[PDB]
Amino acid sequence: SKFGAISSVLNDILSRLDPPEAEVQIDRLITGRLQSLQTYVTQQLIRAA
């Protein structure tokens, strides 16, 4: 998922933009991935109960 950034492939957006330019896009990716992981773990806890 692109998550509102340049593209979903970190290896490409890192070699395409300068670190400051990618920074913003990298943070967009960071928050998307982290929120998805949090959702997964919460649902797993409910299922385990």
């Binding site: 070699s15 395409r16 933009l17 300068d18 330019e21």
Partner: protein, 48 residues
Amino acid sequence: EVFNATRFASVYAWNRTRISNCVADYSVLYNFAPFFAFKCYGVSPTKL
């Protein structure tokens, strides 16, 4: 041959030279023009 010509058409008819099958070194672009605005959006001049 595009940045050192004589009649850069008018904005009502914007000319277009498709460039392919070559190696692009924009240092000639840098040295052929006293740049005033190089505001790029999809590409970085540092990595081009």
